[PDB]
């Protein structure tokens, strides 16, 4: 129920109904969907008005992205049970040496999962690099062991179409981070070692969670950057004319926009007394 002034009714209701139908649409990104960006009122209205409309559209879009909120707890507990699975598979495996394999399973088994949103990435990266080091030790393949050079994340001993399926699923989740596509084709292969198959399913789940994490963070920093620069340009342009209306809209606009909670409070403060600061807004 976002409200602003300066446009007709039909394009506004079309855009706010498109926003509700956003998460069921593929490749959703505002830089990838420029049809919204031509509806802001370029070369049509006054200057403070078009900054106002651009800021409200982008901030409502960011509220809609927080309203979508793609789930990750299911793949988190799935990664935890697959971590326990590959730990129990690497318990009984006879390695080339017991020492460093024992150290790597000791790294892997303690990191079950994490609580908040920040701690997941580094623990899933450490669990994944320990997992692929144990995988390369089980097949006795070589690995980079020079100091300061971490073994990169890669699938081990599979067909080319399967790893290409992994990369196209990576592309499909980097395009749409809201639809979950777990284990599309069969990666459980009886022709290889069951430890290698379990660690390949584990590294698929790790690739999925790091992909959705990176796509989510890049979308929110793009949205936050453009609403930041909209706030700076608006507090530039409104300040040239000293008036009570400009004082009130500035005092709304003083709040920070670094967080979803902060941007939410600033959006509801934009909504709740829109009739107060509307008097200094011309209409063409």
């Amino acid at each position: 129920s976002l409200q602003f002034i300066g446009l007709q009714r039909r394009d506004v209701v079309a855009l706010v109904n498109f926003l509700r139908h956003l998460t069921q649409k593929p490749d959703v990104d505002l830089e990838a969907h420029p049809k919204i960006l031509k509806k802001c009122g370029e070369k049509r209205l006054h200057r403070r008005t078009v900054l106002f409309n651009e800021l409200m559209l982008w901030l409502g879009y960011y509220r809609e992205l927080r309203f979508h909120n793609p789930d990750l707890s299911s793949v988190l507990e799935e990664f935890e049970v697959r971590c326990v699975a590959v730990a129990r598979r690497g318990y009984t495996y006879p390695f080339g040496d017991r020492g460093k394999a024992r150290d790597h399973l000791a790294v892997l088994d303690r990191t079950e999962f994490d609580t908040d949103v920040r701690h997941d990435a580094e623990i899933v990266e450490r669990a994944l690099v320990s997992a692929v080091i144990l995988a390369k030790m089980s097949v006795r393949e070589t690995l980079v062991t020079a100091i300061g050079q971490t073994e990169p994340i890669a699938f081990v001993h599979l067909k080319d179409t399967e790893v290409q399926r992994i990369e196209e699923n990576l592309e499909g989740v980097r395009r749409n981070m809201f639809c979950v596509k777990p284990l599309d084709l069969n990666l459980d292969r009886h022709a290889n070692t069951a430890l290698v198959n379990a660690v390949n399913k584990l590294v698929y789940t790790g690739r999925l969670i790091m992909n959705v994490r990176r796509s989510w963070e890049e979308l929110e920093r793009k949205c936050l950057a453009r609403i930041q620069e909209r706030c700076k340009l608006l507090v530039k342009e409104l300040r040239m004319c000293l008036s009570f209306d400009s004082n009130y809209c500035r005092n709304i606009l003083k709040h920070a926009v670094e967080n979803g909670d902060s941007a939410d409070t600033l959006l509801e403060l934009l909504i709740e007394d829109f009739d107060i600061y509307v008097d200094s807004f011309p209409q063409s």
Partner: peptide, 12 residues
Amino acid sequence: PANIEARHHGVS
């Protein structure tokens, strides 16, 4: 929890 604190300033 961070949600139980909030504040505006210069605003009615």
